[PDB]
Design an enzyme around this catalytic site. Structure first.
Site, PDB file in Angstrom:
ATOM      1  CB  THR B   8      -0.946   0.021   1.160  1.00  0.00           C
ATOM      2  OG1 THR B   8      -0.182  -0.062   2.350  1.00  0.00           O
ATOM      3  CG2 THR B   8      -1.932  -1.113   1.085  1.00  0.00           C
ATOM      4  N   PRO B  10       3.657   4.011  -2.043  1.00  0.00           N
ATOM      5  CG  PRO B  10       5.606   5.279  -2.050  1.00  0.00           C
ATOM      6  CD  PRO B  10       4.657   4.588  -1.125  1.00  0.00           C
ATOM      7  CB  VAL B  11       5.811   0.966  -5.492  1.00  0.00           C
ATOM      8  CG1 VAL B  11       5.796  -0.098  -6.605  1.00  0.00           C
ATOM      9  CG2 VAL B  11       7.131   1.648  -5.439  1.00  0.00           C
ATOM     10  NE  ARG B  32       4.377  -4.298   6.554  1.00  0.00           N
ATOM     11  CZ  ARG B  32       5.574  -4.345   7.144  1.00  0.00           C
ATOM     12  NH1 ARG B  32       5.860  -5.291   8.042  1.00  0.00           N
ATOM     13  NH2 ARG B  32       6.502  -3.443   6.826  1.00  0.00           N
ATOM     14  CB  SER B  36       3.359  -1.571   9.280  1.00  0.00           C
ATOM     15  OG  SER B  36       3.336  -0.290   8.619  1.00  0.00           O
ATOM     16  CD  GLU B  37       0.195   3.476  13.860  1.00  0.00           C
ATOM     17  OE1 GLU B  37       0.035   2.315  14.312  1.00  0.00           O
ATOM     18  OE2 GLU B  37      -0.746   4.290  13.729  1.00  0.00           O
ATOM     19  CG  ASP B  98       6.771 -13.128   6.061  1.00  0.00           C
ATOM     20  OD1 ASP B  98       6.491 -13.975   6.925  1.00  0.00           O
ATOM     21  OD2 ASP B  98       6.423 -11.924   6.135  1.00  0.00           O
ATOM     22  CG  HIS B 215      22.405  -0.075  -3.463  1.00  0.00           C
ATOM     23  ND1 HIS B 215      21.088   0.069  -3.072  1.00  0.00           N
ATOM     24  CD2 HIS B 215      22.689   0.980  -4.248  1.00  0.00           C
ATOM     25  CE1 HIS B 215      20.627   1.208  -3.544  1.00  0.00           C
ATOM     26  NE2 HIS B 215      21.575   1.770  -4.269  1.00  0.00           N
TER      27      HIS B 215
HETATM   28  N1  LIG Z   1      10.970   5.600  -5.791  1.00  0.00           N
HETATM   29  C1  LIG Z   1      10.477   4.514  -5.243  1.00  0.00           C
HETATM   30  O1  LIG Z   1       9.455   4.580  -4.589  1.00  0.00           O
HETATM   31  C2  LIG Z   1      11.269   3.244  -5.437  1.00  0.00           C
HETATM   32  C3  LIG Z   1      10.944   2.079  -4.739  1.00  0.00           C
HETATM   33  N2  LIG Z   1      11.658   0.956  -4.925  1.00  0.00           N
HETATM   34  C4  LIG Z   1      11.325  -0.290  -4.199  1.00  0.00           C
HETATM   35  O2  LIG Z   1      10.020  -0.864  -4.508  1.00  0.00           O
HETATM   36  C5  LIG Z   1       9.495  -1.502  -3.325  1.00  0.00           C
HETATM   37  C6  LIG Z   1       8.214  -0.779  -2.876  1.00  0.00           C
HETATM   38  O3  LIG Z   1       8.559   0.524  -2.346  1.00  0.00           O
HETATM   39  P1  LIG Z   1       7.582   1.760  -1.871  1.00  0.00           P
HETATM   40  O4  LIG Z   1       6.080   1.617  -2.190  1.00  0.00           O
HETATM   41  O5  LIG Z   1       8.267   3.001  -2.415  1.00  0.00           O
HETATM   42  O6  LIG Z   1       7.838   1.863  -0.258  1.00  0.00           O
HETATM   43  P2  LIG Z   1       7.080   1.036   0.905  1.00  0.00           P
HETATM   44  O7  LIG Z   1       8.138   0.728   1.944  1.00  0.00           O
HETATM   45  O8  LIG Z   1       5.827   1.802   1.312  1.00  0.00           O
HETATM   46  O9  LIG Z   1       6.663  -0.278   0.025  1.00  0.00           O
HETATM   47  C7  LIG Z   1       6.779  -1.655   0.376  1.00  0.00           C
HETATM   48  C8  LIG Z   1       5.368  -2.176   0.609  1.00  0.00           C
HETATM   49  O10 LIG Z   1       5.391  -3.546   0.996  1.00  0.00           O
HETATM   50  C9  LIG Z   1       4.935  -3.667   2.355  1.00  0.00           C
HETATM   51  N3  LIG Z   1       5.474  -4.825   3.164  1.00  0.00           N
HETATM   52  C10 LIG Z   1       6.704  -5.005   3.731  1.00  0.00           C
HETATM   53  N4  LIG Z   1       6.742  -6.199   4.410  1.00  0.00           N
HETATM   54  C11 LIG Z   1       5.525  -6.796   4.291  1.00  0.00           C
HETATM   55  C12 LIG Z   1       4.845  -8.049   4.740  1.00  0.00           C
HETATM   56  N5  LIG Z   1       5.484  -8.970   5.483  1.00  0.00           N
HETATM   57  N6  LIG Z   1       3.553  -8.263   4.384  1.00  0.00           N
HETATM   58  C13 LIG Z   1       2.865  -7.383   3.633  1.00  0.00           C
HETATM   59  N7  LIG Z   1       3.411  -6.240   3.188  1.00  0.00           N
HETATM   60  C14 LIG Z   1       4.700  -5.886   3.476  1.00  0.00           C
HETATM   61  C15 LIG Z   1       5.205  -2.288   2.971  1.00  0.00           C
HETATM   62  O11 LIG Z   1       4.454  -2.026   4.165  1.00  0.00           O
HETATM   63  P3  LIG Z   1       4.537  -0.674   5.069  1.00  0.00           P
HETATM   64  O12 LIG Z   1       3.648   0.348   4.368  1.00  0.00           O
HETATM   65  O13 LIG Z   1       3.966  -1.160   6.382  1.00  0.00           O
HETATM   66  O14 LIG Z   1       6.011  -0.300   5.151  1.00  0.00           O
HETATM   67  C16 LIG Z   1       4.797  -1.416   1.794  1.00  0.00           C
HETATM   68  O15 LIG Z   1       3.381  -1.301   1.716  1.00  0.00           O
HETATM   69  C17 LIG Z   1      10.612  -1.422  -2.271  1.00  0.00           C
HETATM   70  O16 LIG Z   1      11.558  -2.515  -2.337  1.00  0.00           O
HETATM   71  C18 LIG Z   1      11.329  -0.143  -2.667  1.00  0.00           C
HETATM   72  O17 LIG Z   1      12.633  -0.061  -2.076  1.00  0.00           O
HETATM   73  C19 LIG Z   1      12.721   0.915  -5.752  1.00  0.00           C
HETATM   74  C20 LIG Z   1      13.158   2.006  -6.501  1.00  0.00           C
HETATM   75  C21 LIG Z   1      12.460   3.287  -6.395  1.00  0.00           C
END
Ligand SMILES: NC(=O)C1=CN([C@@H]2O[C@H](COP(=O)(O)OP(=O)(O)OC[C@H]3O[C@@H](n4cnc5c(N)ncnc54)[C@H](OP(=O)(O)O)[C@@H]3O)[C@@H](O)[C@H]2O)C=CC1
Ligand SMILES: NC(=O)C1=CN([C@@H]2O[C@H](COP(=O)(O)OP(=O)(O)OC[C@H]3O[C@@H](n4cnc5c(N)ncnc54)[C@H](OP(=O)(O)O)[C@@H]3O)[C@@H](O)[C@H]2O)C=CC1
Ligand SMILES: N[C@H](Cc1c[nH]c[nH+]1)C(=O)O
Ligand SMILES: N[C@H](Cc1c[nH]c[nH+]1)C(=O)O
EC number: 1.5.1.52
Lengths: 428, 428
Positions: B8, B10-11, B32, B36-37, B98, B215
Site C-alpha cells: 500500500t 507509493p509504488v 499490513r 505497521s503504523e 513470508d 549497493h
Molecule cells: N521511488 C520509489 O518509490 C522506489 C521504490 N523501490 C522499491 O520498490 C518496493 C516498494 O517501495 P515503496 O512503495 O516506495 O515503499 P514502501 O516501503 O511503502 O513499500 C513496500 C510495501 O510492501 C509492504 N510490506 C513489507 N513487508 C511486508 C509483509 N510482510 N507483508 C505485507 N506487506 C509488506 C510495505 O508495508 P509498510 O507500508 O507497512 O512499510 C509497503 O506497503 C521497495 O523494495 C522499494 O525499495 C525501488 C526504486 C524506487
C-alpha cells in the site's frame, strides 16, 4: 664579501634578510624600474623608509623575520658597477640569460658563485655556459625551488613582505660538490630549521620540483588555454574535475606521458628518476592513509601505466578538499581545489601580459624540448604542449589586432638560451 | 478479471492507478496494519477519502496521474479471501515468501500470474518454487526495477503520492516467453511512453538492476556500517570520496570483485553479462563526453582489471556534482553527491529498525551467496560483505541490550527462501 641579489620581489626580500642576518656579505639588490611599474614602486617604497621588512604568519618561522637595510638598491641592471663575489638570481628563470648579459664585463669577471633560486631544468647549463666566457671556474648552485611562500599583503608597501609557509624539504646541487659555499648553505639551512638535501649536481636539484611535471599538463591543454586567453561563462578552477576544471583521464595521461619523456632525458644524464606520486604525497601535500596504498606509492615507478594514471587521478581527487582541515557542521571541508585561473591582463601601460602560468611553463617546456632534440630523445607530449600554447598566442594576436601586446606573444623566444644549451651539451 | 496488489506504499498506489485506468481487472490492495503504523495510516486515510491520488511533477508523465478508488482495501494479508487471477508484488523482495505463505490455499490455487516489481536476483526462483505447490503452470514475471520514483509529499495524506521521475528503460522477463501477459504489459508500456525491453527470462531482467552490483559495496564496508549503526562526528555522505564518504580505490575494487563473482554466476545460467559501466553511464545518469572514452565504455568487459577500476572510480568522481545542472555565478554546480546515510532508528513502538539500505542488500547478498554455493561458484567478496554486516548487527546487540530490536538483527533469516532456491536448482 659583496653579494648581488637580482630581484626586488618578495623572494628577493626574504633572501636578503637571511643574508643580512646570517652572512658577512654587503648586499646590493637590483631591480628594473626601466621595464616595470612593480620594480619602480618597490624602489620608491624602499627609498622612503630605508628599511625592508619580513613578517611571518606561523611563529614556527622565527629565524626568517626582521627589518633590514641593504647597502645599495640599484634601479636597473645596467646600473650595476663593480665587483661581486656572489650573484643570487631571485628572478624568473626565463630572465636569467637576458639579465646576466646586461651586466658589465668587469662585474661578470669578478663573479665566483651564481645561486639559482627558482631554476628550471637546464638553467644551470645556461648560466654555466654563459658565465664561462668571463670566469673559468664559476661555481653554479641550483635549488629545487624557493624555500616557501612569501608575498606582499599591501601593494602600496611592497617593501613589507609576509612569509606564510616554508617547504618541508629543499634540494640543492652545485657544479662544485661539497664546496665551501654548499657547506655554508647547509649550515644556514640547519639554523633556519629547513631540511635541505644536497644532491650530486644542479640538474639533479632542478628535477626535484613537482611543477615541472604537473604545470604543463594542467595549463597547456585546450580547457586551460581557453580559460586563460579567452575566459569562460562561469569561473572554472585549475584543480577541479571537468567541467569545473581541466582534470580528466586525458589530462592525467598527458601528465604520465610527460613525466616519462622527462625520465628518459634524466636517464641520458644519469640522474636518478623521480617517483612522481611519492613526491606529490610525501613532499607536496598529504592524503589520508585510506586513499592510497603505501606499496603503490613506493613502487610507483614499476607499476603498469594504467595503474600509474589511476593513482595520479586519485591523488588529485583526494585533494579536491583539504582532507585534514576541520570539516564544518554539515561535513564540508575546506575547498582546496577552488584556485582560479589568472587571465591575460593589461599592465598599467595598456600592454597585454600573459600570466606566469603558463608563460613560464612555455619556457620550461621549450627548454626541455630543445634538450630532447640535442640528445635525440623523442618528446611528442612536450611538442604538443608547445603547439597548443603557440596556437593560443597566434589566436590572441589575430583576435586582438587593436591591442598592444607583450613580447611573450612572439615567436620564437629563447634563441639565446637554446644556443647556450647546444654549446654546453657539445662540450659536456 | 481479479487482481491482488500486495503493498500500500507509493509504488503500489502508482501501479494500481495504471491498472484502474488501463486494465479490465477489479483491484483489491493488501496492506499490513498488524505489523505497521505506516500501513495503518494508509488504511485510515483511504477509508476517509475513498480515493487514492497520483500527482506528477514533470508533465512528461501525463498517462500515470489520476484519482481513483479500488474495489477493496484489505487491512492485512491474512484477511485476503477468494480467487485472484493475477498477484502484483509491490512490496520488498525480502518479504515475498513470508507474504505469499500467509495467503489462503484457495487463493493460492486460483493464481495464474505473479508479477514482481522490485525483485532481487533469485526472486523469481523463490516465487516460482513456492507457488508450484498450488498451481502447476504459474506464470512469474520479473521487472528489472520499479518504473520510476514515487513518494508521499505529506505523511498525513499517504494516499496522495507524487511520481517525480520515470526510468529511461525497464527490462521484463517471464517464465512464459511472449505470453499474453508479456504482450499486454508491452502494449501498456508503449502507451505510458516507457521503454521496455523484453528479455529471455525473469532472471535476465533481475540482473539489469544497477543497485545489485553497486549497493553492496557502497553500504557493506566499515565506513558505511559505522555511519549507519554508530553514527559519526560530522555528517558523511554515501557518494562522496573519503573522508567525506566511503568512496575509495578499495571500495571500487570491491565493486569490481563483486560484479565479477556475479558475472560467473550468470555464465552458469547462460544469461548475457552486464557491461556495468555502460549500464551506469547510458542508463542510470550521464556524464560529459570529455569524462569517459566511448571505446572504454563499449569495451568495458574486455579491458584489464585495473582499467575497469579506474573507469568506475572516474564515473563516481564525475557525478560528485550534476555536470548537466546549471552552474551558479561562482561556477559551482548542484551537489548531487550529498546524499546522507539513513541511520538505525526507532519506530513509533520504540523498536530499533535497520533502514532499507543496507537491510535489503543483506537479503540480496545472502541470496546470491546461497546461489553461489548451490552452483559451486566461489563468492569470497560477497562472503566478506555478509560477515561485515553480521558483525555490525552483533555489535549493535551487544552495545544496546536495553533497547528493543527488530528481527532484522537476528541470524539467520531467509531459511525458507534459501530452501526454495535449493529446491528450484535441483530440478532446473
Ligand atoms: N521511488 C520509489 O518509490 C522506489 C521504490 N523501490 C522499491 O520498490 C518496493 C516498494 O517501495 P515503496 O512503495 O516506495 O515503499 P514502501 O516501503 O511503502 O513499500 C513496500 C510495501 O510492501 C509492504 N510490506 C513489507 N513487508 C511486508 C509483509 N510482510 N507483508 C505485507 N506487506 C509488506 C510495505 O508495508 P509498510 O507500508 O507497512 O512499510 C509497503 O506497503 C521497495 O523494495 C522499494 O525499495 C525501488 C526504486 C524506487
Ligand atoms: N611564494 C612565492 O613567492 C614563490 C615564488 N616562486 C618563484 O620565484 C621567482 C621569484 O618570485 P617573486 O619574488 O615571488 O615574484 P616577482 O615576480 O616579484 O619576482 C621576480 C623578480 O625578478 C624580476 N625580473 C623579471 N624579469 C627581469 C629582467 N629582465 N631583469 C631584471 N629583473 C627581472 C621581477 O621584476 P618585477 O618586480 O618588475 O616583476 C621580480 O623582481 C619567480 O619565478 C616565482 O614564480 C616560486 C614558488 C613560490
Ligand atoms: N600544493 C600543490 C598545489 C595545489 C593543489 N590544490 C591547491 N593548490 C599541490 O598540488 O600539491
Ligand atoms: N542515480 C544513482 C544514485 C545517485 C548517485 N548520486 C546521487 N544519487 C546513480 O549512481 O547513478
Amino acid at each position: 664579501s659583496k653579494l648581488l641579489m637580482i630581484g626586488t620581489g618578495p623572494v628577493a626580500i626574504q633572501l636578503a634578510n637571511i643574508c643580512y642576518l646570517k652572512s658577512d656579505y654587503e648586499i646590493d639588490m637590483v631591480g628594473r624600474a626601466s621595464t616595470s611599474e612593480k620594480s619602480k614602486r618597490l624602489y620608491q617604497a624602499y627609498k622612503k623608509e630605508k628599511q625592508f621588512e619580513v613578517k611571518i604568519q606561523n611563529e614556527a618561522h622565527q629565524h626568517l623575520e626582521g627589518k633590514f637595510e641593504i647597502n645599495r638598491l640599484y634601479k636597473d641592471v645596467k646600473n650595476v658597477k663593480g665587483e661581486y663575489e656572489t650573484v643570487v638570481m631571485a628572478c624568473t628563470a626565463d630572465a636569467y640569460y637576458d639579465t646576466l648579459q646586461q651586466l658589465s664585463l668587469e662585474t661578470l669577471q669578478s663573479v665566483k658563485h651564481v645561486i639559482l633560486i627558482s631554476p628550471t631544468f637546464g638553467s644551470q647549463m645556461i648560466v654555466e655556459q654563459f658565465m664561462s666566457k668571463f670566469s673559468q671556474d664559476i661555481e653554479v648552485i641550483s635549488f629545487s625551488t624557493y624555500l616557501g611562500d612569501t608575498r606582499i599583503v599591501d601593494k602600496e608597501a611592497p617593501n613589507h613582505v609576509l612569509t606564510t609557509g616554508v617547504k618541508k624539504k629543499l634540494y640543492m646541487g652545485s657544479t662544485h660538490s661539497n664546496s665551501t659555499m654548499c657547506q655554508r648553505i647547509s649550515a644556514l639551512a640547519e639554523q633556519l630549521k629547513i631540511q635541505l638535501e644536497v644532491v650530486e649536481s644542479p640538474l639533479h636539484a632542478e628535477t626535484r620540483n613537482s611543477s615541472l611535471y604537473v604545470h604543463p599538463p594542467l595549463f597547456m591543454n585546450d580547457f586551460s588555454l581557453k580559460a586563460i586567453f579567452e575566459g569562460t561563462d562561469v569561473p572554472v578552477y585549475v584543480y577541479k574535475l571537468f567541467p569545473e576544471g581541466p582534470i580528466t583521464m586525458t589530462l592525467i595521461r598527458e601528465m604520465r606521458l610527460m613525466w616519462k619523456e622527462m625520465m628518459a632525458i634524466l636517464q641520458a644524464f644519469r640522474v636518478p628518476s623521480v617517483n612522481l606520486l611519492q613526491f606529490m604525497v610525501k613532499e607536496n601535500y598529504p592524503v589520508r592513509p585510506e586513499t592510497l596504498d603505501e606499496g603503490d606509492i613506493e613502487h610507483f615507478e614499476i607499476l603498469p601505466d594504467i595503474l600509474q594514471e589511476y593513482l595520479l587521478y586519485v591523488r588529485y581527487t583526494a585533494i579536491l578538499i583539504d582532507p585534514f582541515s576541520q570539516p564544518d557542521e554539515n561535513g564540508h571541508y575546506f575547498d582546496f581545489s577552488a584556485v582560479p585561473f589568472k587571465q591575460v591582463y593589461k599592465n598599467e601601460q595598456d600592454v597585454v601580459q600573459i600570466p606566469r602560468m603558463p608563460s613560464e611553463d612555455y619556457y620550461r617546456t621549450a627548454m626541455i624540448q630543445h634538450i630532447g632534440k640535442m640528445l635525440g630523445i623523442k618528446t611528442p607530449m612536450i611538442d604538443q604542449f608547445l603547439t597548443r600554447y603557440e596556437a593560443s598566442c597566434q589566436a590572441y594576436k589575430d583576435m586582438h589586432q587593436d591591442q598592444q601586446l607583450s613580447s611573450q606573444f612572439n615567436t620564437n623566444l629563447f634563441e639565446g638560451d637554446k644556443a647556450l644549451v647546444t654549446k654546453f651539451l657539445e662540450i659536456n
